[PDB]
A paper describes a structure:
The MlaFEDB complex is an ATP-binding cassette transporter to actively translocate the phospholipids between the inner membrane and the periplasmic protein MlaC4,5. The MlaFEDB-mediated glycerophospholipid (PL) transport was reported to play an important role in maintaining the integrity of the lipid membrane. Consistent with the previous reported low-resolution A. baumannii MlaFEDB map8 and our E. coli MlaFEDB map9 (EMD-30355), the MlaF (cytoplasmic nucleotide-binding domain, NBD), MlaE (transmembrane domain), MlaD (periplasmic phospholipid-binding domain), and MlaB (cytoplasmic auxiliary domain) subunits are assembled in a stoichiometry of 2:2:6:2. In summary, we characterize four structures of the A. baumannii MlaFEDB complex in nucleotide-free and vanadate-trapped conformations using single-particle cryo-EM.
To understand the mechanism of glycerophospholipid translocation coupled with the conformational change, distinct conformations of MlaFEDB were trapped using sodium ortho-vanadate. Vanadate acts as a potent inhibitor of ATPase by forming an ADP–vanadate complex that mimics the intermediate state formed during hydrolysis. Three individual conformations were classified and refined to 4.0, 3.6, and 4.0 Å, and were named Vtrans1, Vtrans2, and Vclose, respectively. All three structures display bound nucleotides at the ATP-binding sites. However, the maps are of insufficient quality to distinguish between ADP, ATP, and ADP–vanadate. Comparison of Vtrans1 and Vtrans2 to nucleotide-free structure shows the conformational rearrangement of the MlaD. MlaD hexametric ring rotates clockwise at different levels, whereas MlaFEB remains unchanged. The three vanadate-trapped structures of MlaFEDB reveal different levels of conformational rearrangement of MlaD and MlaE coupled with nucleotide binding and glycerophospholipid translocation.
Author numbering:
A (entry chain K), C (entry chain I): 3 to 57
B (entry chain J): 3 to 193
D (entry chain I): 171 to 193
E (entry chain D), F (entry chain A): 1 to 256
The structure:
Amino acid sequence: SRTSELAVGIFVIIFGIALFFLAMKVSGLVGTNLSDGYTMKAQFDNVNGLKPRAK
Amino acid sequence: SRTSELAVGIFVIIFGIALFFLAMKVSGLVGTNLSDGYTMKAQFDNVNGLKPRAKVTMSGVTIGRVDSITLDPVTRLATVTFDLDGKLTSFNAEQLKEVQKNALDELRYSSDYTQATPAQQKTMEQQLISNMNSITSIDEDAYIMVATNGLLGEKYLKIVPGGGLNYLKRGDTISNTQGTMDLEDLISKFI
Amino acid sequence: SRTSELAVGIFVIIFGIALFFLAMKVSGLVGTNLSDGYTMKAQFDNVNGLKPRAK
Amino acid sequence: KRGDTISNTQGTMDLEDLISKFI
Amino acid sequence: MNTIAWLGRLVIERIRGIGVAALMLLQIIFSLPSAGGFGRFVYQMHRVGVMSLLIITVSGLFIGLVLGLQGYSILVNVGSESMLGTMVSLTLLRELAPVVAALLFAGRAGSALTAEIGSMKQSEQLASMEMIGVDPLKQIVSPRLWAGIVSLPMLTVIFAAIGIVGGKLVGVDFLGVDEGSFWSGMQNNVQFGHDVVNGIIKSIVFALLCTWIAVFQGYACDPTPEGIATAMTRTVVYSSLCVLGFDFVLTAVMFG
Amino acid sequence: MNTIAWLGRLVIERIRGIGVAALMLLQIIFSLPSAGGFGRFVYQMHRVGVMSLLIITVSGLFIGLVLGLQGYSILVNVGSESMLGTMVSLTLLRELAPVVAALLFAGRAGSALTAEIGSMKQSEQLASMEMIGVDPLKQIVSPRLWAGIVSLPMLTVIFAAIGIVGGKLVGVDFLGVDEGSFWSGMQNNVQFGHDVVNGIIKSIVFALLCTWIAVFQGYACDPTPEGIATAMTRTVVYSSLCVLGFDFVLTAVMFG
């Protein structure tokens, strides 16, 4: 039985990591939650104060 | 015995006060109520942070919200739907003659009727059937715009009035507009 | 000695109940009205963001 | 008297009017 | 290499200990209630809830007097303190009243349940109740769990209401800001369904963890008069870590 | 009129309970130390301080991740988040790290002393120590009091340092603000002697109250295995009320 307890315990924590990496994606705070993205680029002469994750 | 049935009944009362105090003395719930509203819409060339559920003003008074700001990708212009009210912005039961006695006043004037196509009862009967329902206080020569209050506050919509011989009916597109100005606009226009 | 053990009971329960009125008075949910006030009016053309109960 | 009407007003001068006039 | 061997043996027993407390929760909530189960829940709402009413109402005032006194000292340099009524009622409603009122519930009414179910285990009242045939999970434990999930979200509202009223006292009536711009700054920026409801859902997830831990530690003790008191600090520590841990996860979802 | 007579009888015993705990403090600190008194203070710094190091460092990180995530959601609407590094390190240094790190010290290491001195009172170790001639206040109680006044101000600094570093992680490296304007916003607005020293003096007054209460409750128990556990909730409640009570008095003086 003790083994049973153990298992039913490794399944809580693994589910506890499945939630933390769901709520970190839907927050926007990791990954890319915007669909079918395609990439373009440009060439400036001066871009001040522009980090990634801009609008 | 009866104490433990009573001293819980007090605990639900003090929760009942301090929940009612939050909804209707702190949070905005009692102040937001669309009194039999409808919906109009517009198209903009810049909406730089017009957040949804903003306010719409006519003369500096809250008569509307904001519901959806999406692009129109066949022209790449904005699309805003705002729900005004049906008591602050339209003519009610007694008021229906006040716009037919104004249509007869400045619009059906004889010097104005003798400036268009010749008739005697064409526009004279139209002003009794078009003007009775589906009509707001907004004269159609009133162009909506985005503004802000102060220099830190959120973006809100402003309807500047004036003129106007027909009124916007229902679900109509407000004619002219102007966008919002910020530093990328002003200093490139201050010269 | 019971009068000593009961004087403290009232002197607490005064302070426990009179402090509820002072916490109900300053929450604005009771009273909050002036002394023999009246009501004028004026009619503007553009009140840019004049919320009610402003000074 | 009480209840009367003050009738000499002026409206607010906002920045969308002011800065566009300040040009 | 014994210390590494003792450290690995420590966290294996603490992992298994979660699995027992998970199976204990599925036996309580997946059962239709026995006859007489509502008469004990009303009584257990008196012990857990009503006795905790004095500490929360008093300590909720002391944070409101601090938030009004600190928010005025910062917002007077930038000269914009029509936002004083916003930042006081925005610090409490979404952040402090869900969190601090769970750090005081874990102490007062959290650890008291672990002493209450714990002293029933060393004095053999739980073992005596079972031989009669009465199941002690349904009889003793289950009216204490449902009186914890209900009594904390009723207490963060009393914490948040007294905290704003206390912040109105030192802001408006002692430091001298405008009363009308205090309240009208609230109704513009503080919505109901985004702020007051999301401050209640944050406390239901907190009330489940501060009660399911505080019940399991007093049910799975070791029956010993100094084994009870070692499980009352195990339930204040583990509650305060799961409150602050599920704080960041719920904040990132709701306000991200 | 019995309930008012019982209520007045309750707060009279709680008033004379303060007077015993005041006379107990004047007997501890007004004495030159016995031979061997430093060897027990180093050992009692291990139990109180070092065992509390894990909860404070982990929970200090979780507040920093919340303060960086909430301060960014507010300061992005006004568009000024070069003050993000200021308001994170100003919320912690003067307000949260003195207060929250005393609400976790009252639970973990506060109530553990009341179980430790309390179980020595029911099992007659304190009475047996006195008949040998050794005074139990100088022998047992006094190395525990001085290990509480030292170990908490060493722990609010570790709370405040880990909270800022955690707030730098979610602000700069995850949400994307400038790293140089994060740190240079700190050195302009955050002084040392007005902010970091006044966050330490606030925790010495807190460390005295969370230890003098937690020692007196375990010394003046009633010797009973369920009378000990009722005095471990008396010392978490009374510590959390004196922390938040002396918060407002010390804030009004320092930042008024």
